[PDB]
Design a protein around this nucleic acid. Sequence first.
RNA 1: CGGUGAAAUGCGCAGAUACCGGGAGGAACGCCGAUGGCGAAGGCAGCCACCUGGUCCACCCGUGACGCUGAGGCGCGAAAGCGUGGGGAGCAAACCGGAUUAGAUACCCGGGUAGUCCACGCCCUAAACGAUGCGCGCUAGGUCUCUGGGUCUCCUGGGGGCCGAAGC
Lengths: 88, 71, 138, 101
Amino acid sequence: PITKEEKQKVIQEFARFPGDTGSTEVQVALLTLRINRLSEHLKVHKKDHHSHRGLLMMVGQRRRLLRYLQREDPERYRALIEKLGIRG
Amino acid sequence: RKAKVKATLGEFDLRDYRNVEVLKRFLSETGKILPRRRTGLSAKEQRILAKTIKRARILGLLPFTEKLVRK
Amino acid sequence: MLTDPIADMLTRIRNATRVYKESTDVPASRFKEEILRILAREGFIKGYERVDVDGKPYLRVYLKYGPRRQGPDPRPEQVIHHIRRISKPGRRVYVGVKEIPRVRRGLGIAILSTSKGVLTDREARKLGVGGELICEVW
Amino acid sequence: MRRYEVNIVLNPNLDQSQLALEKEIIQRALENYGARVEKVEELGLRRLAYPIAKDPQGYFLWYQVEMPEDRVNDLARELRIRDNVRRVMVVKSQEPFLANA
RNA sequence: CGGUGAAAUGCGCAGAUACCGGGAGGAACGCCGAUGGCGAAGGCAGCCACCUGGUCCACCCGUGACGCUGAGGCGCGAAAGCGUGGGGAGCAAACCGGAUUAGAUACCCGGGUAGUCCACGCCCUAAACGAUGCGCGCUAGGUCUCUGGGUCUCCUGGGGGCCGAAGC
Ligand SMILES: [Mg+2]
Ligand SMILES: [Mg+2]
Ligand SMILES: [Mg+2]
Ligand SMILES: [Mg+2]
Ligand SMILES: [Mg+2]
Ligand SMILES: [Mg+2]
Ligand SMILES: [Mg+2]
Ligand SMILES: [Mg+2]
Ligand SMILES: [Mg+2]
Ligand SMILES: [Mg+2]
Ligand SMILES: [Mg+2]
Ligand SMILES: [Mg+2]
Ligand SMILES: [Mg+2]
Ligand SMILES: [Mg+2]
Ligand SMILES: [Mg+2]
Ligand SMILES: [Mg+2]
Ligand SMILES: [Mg+2]
Ligand SMILES: [Mg+2]
Ligand SMILES: [Mg+2]
Ligand SMILES: [Mg+2]
Ligand SMILES: [Mg+2]
Ligand SMILES: [Mg+2]
């Protein structure tokens, strides 16, 4: 899985200010995690079709948040993407 | 209400798959896991018990099946 | 999700009345409160009062009914017999002045949103202006 | 990492100097696979409900260990090679569910 | 012996059936098991560990409308069925034989190949059904049940059923 300790260090990494338990950047971050983490599982388990379902949902969600941020503050969008290497 | 095995017992661990002397009492004259009707167990309890007995049988302690002796 | 909150308001009142509720609360909005202000004047409701549900702005609409009746069903005549949303999102309905309609031979209301306010058909036709045709009542 | 409960059943007929050597080889597999032992209960032997491996008794080991997760499966089929082991069952530790009336 | 309404085909003195012990093999998991649970659907029940999705409740801490729907596209998709390879206990289309019957050329009985099983790639249909698209707000209650929380007589969420106000 992801242990609390692991995920917390992600949070603190992207946190827009001390204590931000969940801004946009943070949500994208934590979500980006869960995706790579799950995608990797799916390279091994190509038959877990059911879990793939949740992956589309996670992915699509990640897009809508970014989509929002692109419109909102296009700079924090560049930042957040580069700082995570996405859109490809 | 013939006899409820919830009452004839103190408190015990339902996840304890080694406590034969307890578990023994939730089976029939055959190895069969008693119905919740005779066990008096909760809805949640019975599912837990259910797994514990299965675990314990596989360990060799409780029987899968018996043979009915006309008593 | 919620898409029309004026529909939602009207429909809140409709459903309320059919059960002879004495009153129902409706999430507030400058606009809705205008429509209510109108409904008040014209006597379809006893009035609305602005209240607070869990520190959330709301509008207590206080409904009005007929008198009890004899016969084997005594549930009062409605006062708001029929309330109905006309311009809706995903088909707006704008009316020029010489196209503002008459509701029930003069007996009902059409509530209009104009650049001069939220007006009744008569109020608007008097100020010589038209606008969005919100709902009809009677 | 996670904590478990290693069960092992051995045949009852091992003389002391033979049973002692399966207890060590167990303890060296444990040793080997990161499995830090927290506590042990040798219940000795009970009479089974059915003939495991043709004999009506079985010798019982228990071990509340602390493996790292992803190696538990190795440990087991590594424990289970030893011929005098009749059954191994490792199991995740969980808080007791209490019931009465 | 088996087998049916009765019976034959079949199997049996190369010793069957019934009984005890040994071994191999495949496929499905009795009791729990519910009128229960989970899943978007198709669907999912021995046990264990690993990897993994959805989801509910409490706290009311963070973001600050970021939301809903969705032509085409893309993925999932029972059973049967196709290609290659492996597997084959039981079952069993076709086919073989026994009976029945006016005639069976079916329903009944004895066999039996595909198939049913695993992997990989296809097929993409269904009474794929709640024959009820998704999302949100509003409109009496009673009762049974699975599952959270509380100051747990009762209160308060989320499911699953039955009965019913208004209405339809
Ligand atoms: Mg015009
Ligand atoms: Mg035999
Ligand atoms: Mg064979
Ligand atoms: Mg469901
Ligand atoms: Mg179904
Ligand atoms: Mg807050
Ligand atoms: Mg702000
Ligand atoms: Mg703020
Ligand atoms: Mg969506
Ligand atoms: Mg959609
Ligand atoms: Mg298919
Ligand atoms: Mg198939
Ligand atoms: Mg094939
Ligand atoms: Mg083949
Ligand atoms: Mg024939
Ligand atoms: Mg046949
Ligand atoms: Mg056959
Ligand atoms: Mg809530
Ligand atoms: Mg409850
Ligand atoms: Mg309910
Ligand atoms: Mg009904
Ligand atoms: Mg009625």
